[PDB]
Amino acid sequence: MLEQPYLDLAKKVLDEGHFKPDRTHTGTYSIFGHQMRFDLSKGFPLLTTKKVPFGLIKSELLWFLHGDTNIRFLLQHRNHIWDEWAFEKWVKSDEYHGPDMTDFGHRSQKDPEFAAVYHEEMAKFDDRVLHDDAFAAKYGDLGLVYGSQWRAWHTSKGDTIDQLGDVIEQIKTHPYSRRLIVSAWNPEDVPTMALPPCHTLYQFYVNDGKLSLQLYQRSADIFLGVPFNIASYALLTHLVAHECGLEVGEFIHTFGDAHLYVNHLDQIKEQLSRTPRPAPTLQLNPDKHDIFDFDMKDIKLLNYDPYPAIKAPVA
Amino acid sequence: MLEQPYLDLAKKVLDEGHFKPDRTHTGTYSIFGHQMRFDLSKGFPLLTTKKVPFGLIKSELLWFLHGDTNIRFLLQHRNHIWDEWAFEKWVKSDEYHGPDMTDFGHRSQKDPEFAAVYHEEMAKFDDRVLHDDAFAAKYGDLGLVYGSQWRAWHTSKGDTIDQLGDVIEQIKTHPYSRRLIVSAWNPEDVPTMALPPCHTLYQFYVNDGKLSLQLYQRSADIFLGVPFNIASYALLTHLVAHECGLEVGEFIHTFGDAHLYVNHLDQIKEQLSRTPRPAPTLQLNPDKHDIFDFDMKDIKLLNYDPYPAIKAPVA
Numbered sequence: 001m002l003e004q005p006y007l008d009l010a011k012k013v014l015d016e017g018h019f020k021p022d023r024t025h026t027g028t029y030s031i032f033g034h035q036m037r038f039d040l041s042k043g044f045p046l047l048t049t050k051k052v053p054f055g056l057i058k059s060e061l062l063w064f065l066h067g068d069t070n071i072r073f074l075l076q077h078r079n080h081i082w083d084e085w086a087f088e089k090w091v092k093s094d095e096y097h098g099p100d101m102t103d104f105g106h107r108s109q110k111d112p113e114f115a116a117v118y119h120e121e122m123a124k125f126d127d128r129v130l131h132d133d134a135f136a137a138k139y140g141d142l143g144l145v146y147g148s149q150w151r152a153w154h155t156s157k158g159d160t161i162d163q164l165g166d167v168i169e170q171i172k173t174h175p176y177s178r179r180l181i182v183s184a185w186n187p188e189d190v191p192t193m194a195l196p197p198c199h200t201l202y203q204f205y206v207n208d209g210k211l212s213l214q215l216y217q218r219s220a221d222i223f224l225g226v227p228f229n230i231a232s233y234a235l236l237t238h239l240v241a242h243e244c245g246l247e248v249g250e251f252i253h254t255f256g257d258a259h260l261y262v263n264h265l266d267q268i269k270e271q272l273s274r275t276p277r278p279a280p281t282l283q284l285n286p287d288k289h290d291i292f293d294f295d296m297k298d299i300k301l302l303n304y305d306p307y308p309a310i311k312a313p314v315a
Numbered sequence: 316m317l318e319q320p321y322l323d324l325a326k327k328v329l330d331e332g333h334f335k336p337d338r339t340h341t342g343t344y345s346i347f348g349h350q351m352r353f354d355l356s357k358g359f360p361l362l363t364t365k366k367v368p369f370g371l372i373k374s375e376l377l378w379f380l381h382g383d384t385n386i387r388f389l390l391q392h393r394n395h396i397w398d399e400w401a402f403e404k405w406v407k408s409d410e411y412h413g414p415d416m417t418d419f420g421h422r423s424q425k426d427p428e429f430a431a432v433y434h435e436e437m438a439k440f441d442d443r444v445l446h447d448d449a450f451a452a453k454y455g456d457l458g459l460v461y462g463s464q465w466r467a468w469h470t471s472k473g474d475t476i477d478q479l480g481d482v483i484e485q486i487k488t489h490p491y492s493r494r495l496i497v498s499a500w501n502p503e504d505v506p507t508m509a510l511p512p513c514h515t516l517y518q519f520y521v522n523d524g525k526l527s528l529q530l531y532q533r534s535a536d537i538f539l540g541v542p543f544n545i546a547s548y549a550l551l552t553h554l555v556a557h558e559c560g561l562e563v564g565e566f567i568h569t570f571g572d573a574h575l576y577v578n579h580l581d582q583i584k585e586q587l588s589r590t591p592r593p594a595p596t597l598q599l600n601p602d603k604h605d606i607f608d609f610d611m612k613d614i615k616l617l618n619y620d621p622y623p624a625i626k627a628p629v630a
Contacts, residue, residue: 018522018523020491020522021491022491022493030522032520032522032527032529032567033350033352033527033529033567033569034350035348035349035350035569037348153502153503154471155471155502155503156469156470156471156503157503161502161503163502166506176335176336176337178337178533178534178571178572179505179511179533179534181500181515181533183498183500183502185496185498185500185516187468187470187476187478187498188468188470188471188472188476190494191481196494200496200516201500201515201516201531203533203571205347205571205572207333207335207345207347208333212347212348214347214348214571216516216531216569218493218494218496218518219493219494252347252348254348254350254531254569256493256518256520256529257493257520
């Protein structure tokens with residue numbers, strides 16, 4: 001069944017994982033080193049064993065593909081995956097004259113109404129970003145995010161390299177290249193910043209007139225993360241394939257540390273007693289071929305009949 | 316037997332490989348995506364099924380570890396793996412007033428005496444590098460090599476980051492880090508240069524008080540390359556383990572494109588009918604713990620009883 005390499009990872013982490021005290025200790029089971037393959041000709045590897053929001057995914061991949069870094073795009077799509085980040089830096093100094101929130105991702109988890117403060121304060125911020133150009137520009141731009149380092153790497157000599165656009169230029173002239181590699185890792189930014197990338201490095205490849213893609217992800221959350229990630233890059237594999245006129249091969253997900261957090265073993269345990277269903281067909285716009293000029297309504301997904309989504313808390 | 320994951324790779328490439336016209340077409344069998352593990356507590360994964368020069372390896376890793384980039388070190392150790400590179404750039408313009416050699420790695424393969432010209436000319440160059448400070452400085456320094464981008468990455472603001480030395484600083488304070496990553500890939504240099512790295516990215520990890528290491532190599536030569544590479548990084552895993560006071564775990568070799576060139580199928584076929592022997596024990600100096608201050612005579616290897624080495628031509 002298409003998503004089984006998923007399910008197998010978590011079976012592995014569960015009974016082969018190691019405990020690491022490593023958060024704020026908190027706990028994890030973690031394996032170092034794992035490839036996993038998906039044949040993208042069988043289906044779209046959106047997990048059927050719990051409902052996953054494909055639109056939070058195809059929006060987030062369209063931000064990346066537009067070279068975007070400002071929050072505002074996403075919040076114009078009901079997409080709240082990046083908020084936390086920007087809001088933190090908002091609640092840092094100035095206009096911010098309101099209720100401090102150090103460790104709000106904990107005080108707002110070990111709360112009751114420390115949740116409503118944050119959730120009004122965030123209601124607020126998200127609205128500031130939405131309408132105050134002025135504001136948006138300053139706080140909603142996160143600056144170093146994936147779309148930034150995919151499409152505009154700052155080079156020592158002053159320019160900006162569209163690292164993806166050039167690799168897409170070599171798929172079409174040099175399909176047999178062994179260097180079709182985009183990095184999001186920058187040695188010097190890496191230690192200043194909040195979130196050194198998980199989705200560290202990717203290489204494409206061509207044979208048989210089909211595109212296969214390989215991701216090196218450095219840290220992973222089996223429960224809450226990996227189901228969403230499989231789809232971002234399985235979609236990337238389909239639109240680059242789509243634009244370079246080739247067919248979709250395979251998506252290979254390689255992990256350095258994979259880990260399940262301890263508060264997720266319950267859910268992941270229950271998910272596992274379910275039985276994967278025939279997976280959705282992905283299907284994109286022929287009349288449109290400009291992928292950096294794609295919008296929402298041109299990637300369509302059909303026949304995703306999941307099981308119920310499982311709520312879990314993030315750790 | 317310790318080196319079997321090797322042997323299995325080539326069995327895979329051989330009967331699962333694809334033909335790619337991709338050199339100067341010339342031919343290869345190539346797979347995209349492969350992890351491979353070595354438990355470094357069983358032995359040192361220096362192939363027993365053909366003689367491999369461990370000293371060409373432990374010298375080359377000491378150049379890297381000294382932040383070195385000049386050829387001269389290596390040529391002071393009978394180490395000719397990097398020559399070709401430097402010599403090419405020598406035979407580019409000036410003092411060079413001698414027999415052009417465009418495509419000498421072919422004219423000097425599809426030759427007879429076009430070999431003696433090169434091999435006197437190179438005798439010569441190597442000697443220039445050896446004794447002419449002046450010269451060495453200019454031609455024997457290759458500039459962007461692994462030791463350069465491990466220990467002195469040029470950052471946009473003017474400094475040089477000792478990316479390895481800092482990660483070795485975090486093994487000892489932050490052993491449970493999920494970011495123990497050194498890159499040799501630089502987005503902007505990458506397209507100017509000759510040889511964009513194969514040994515692209517590496518991450519270390521700690522559990523159980525033992526160090527395991529993971530390499531992402533982007534292109535690989537199963538026959539002539541991979542046996543030498545397994546040892547460079549299996550040695551790195553032992554000396555970092557050695558200096559951070561921890562034990563040696565495992566070495567995980569992940570490959571994007573693995574490939575065997577067509578002129579190597581014979582040899583690799585014959586190697587495979589051999590039967591791997593108990594592997595050598597690696598053993599390093601206790602009194603010395605400064606690994607960047609290591610020299611040759613402090614890494615010792617014992618009990619390597621290989622089969623005969625198999626000569627093959629490079630393609």
